Amino acid sequence: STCDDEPIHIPGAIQPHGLLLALAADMTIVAGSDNLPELTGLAIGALIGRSAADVFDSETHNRLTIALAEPGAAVGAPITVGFTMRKDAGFIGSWHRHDQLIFLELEPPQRDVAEPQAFFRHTNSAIRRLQAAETLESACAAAAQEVRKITGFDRVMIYRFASDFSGEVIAEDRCAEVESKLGQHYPASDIPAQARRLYTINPVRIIPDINYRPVPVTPDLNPVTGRPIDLSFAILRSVSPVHLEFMRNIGMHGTMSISILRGERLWGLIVCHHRTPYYVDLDGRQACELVAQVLARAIGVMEE
Ligand SMILES: *C/C=C1/C(=C/c2[nH]c(/C=C3[NH+]=C(/C=C4\NC(=O)C(C=C)=C4C)C(C)=C\3CCC(=O)O)c(CCC(=O)O)c2C)NC(=O)[C@H]1C
Secondary structure, eight states: OOSTTOOTTOOOEEOTTSEEEEEOTTSBEEEEETTHHHHTOOOHHHHTTSBGGGTBOHHHHHHHHHHHSSSSOOSOOOEEOOBSTTGGGOOEEOEEOOTTSEEEEEOOOOOSOOOHHHHHHHHHHHHHHHHTOOOHHHHHHHHHHHHHHHHOOSEEEEEEEOTTSOEEEOOOEEOSSSOOOTTOEEOTTSSOHHHHHHHTTOOEEEESOSSOOOEEEESOOOTTTOSOOOOSSOTTBOOOHHHHHHHHHTTOSOEEEEEEESSSSEEEEEEEEOSSOOOOOHHHHHHHHHHHHHHHHTTSSSOO
8 A cells, every 4th residue: 555545635735726615514714725815805814713704795605504504414516606805706616514614615717608509419419328328338438429529628538447446448539649548457556545435425526737736725624623624525625746747647737537436336437638737617527427427327227
């Protein structure tokens, strides 16, 4: 376990392309990313231990209050965000009720959004083409082709693993400019235990610049538990510089990867790489999110 030891879940930093705010269970600001001042225009060391009401507009707190005290408490779905300071901003992104804190992840207004009809088109065709569920090999390739058709990543591919957690690429499509790993296998050390354990419970992962400077999370002391701040579900979660190397190697300054859950069990991953630094509309992500959700289902009617 030269590999499986790293605490990648508690690195106490996020990627700069958005920010984070962590509230205690009585709705008071507890910790944030240190770039908070840069964009919302509010100084961290001030915020620490004051009210979430100082940052959000009155609805976003209220939509917040209802969502959380909703029964079936869990890492929340995406929310619409407006700040009292810089309302204009209209940042939009998720929240996450883990660690006995309420994490808010906020993203910059994804300008130049997916054309509607084209969107519905690709979403709908895929769910037909995948549900049309030809073989396993197409079901998958399909997902990759379609996924590439939605996002427009330079190369995309379905990765499955054996019971010894070594995987094979079992599908592909590429911009005719980069090799097909369609025949390669890889060793379980490559995506190791703790990262397999993490993908099972949070099925989206996105890195836009592999060449980034991590935005510390301050404090990174969980006030309720007194352990570092645990960034499992955070899609802004700073990433193990080892792996980053391995993406520099294979020549890709952006990634994203989606789990393929098969009854609590991680069957395989959609895996995307893009030469230069590349982002995804929540649209873009939730689409793919969908692809793998159906695929996983168009695997649970191929398993009978
Ligand atoms: C022994 C340590 C190693 C290691 C650790 C490591 N790697 C990751 C993350 C990923 N590695 C991936 C592998 C691939 N990328 C590809 O291009 C291909 C295909 C040829 C594979 C199989 C991938 C996709 C990931 C996940 C990244 C993503 O979500 O897009 C981690 C986890 C890092 C984190 O979650 O913060 C770790 C600890 N890297 C190695 O290559 C070996 C030597």
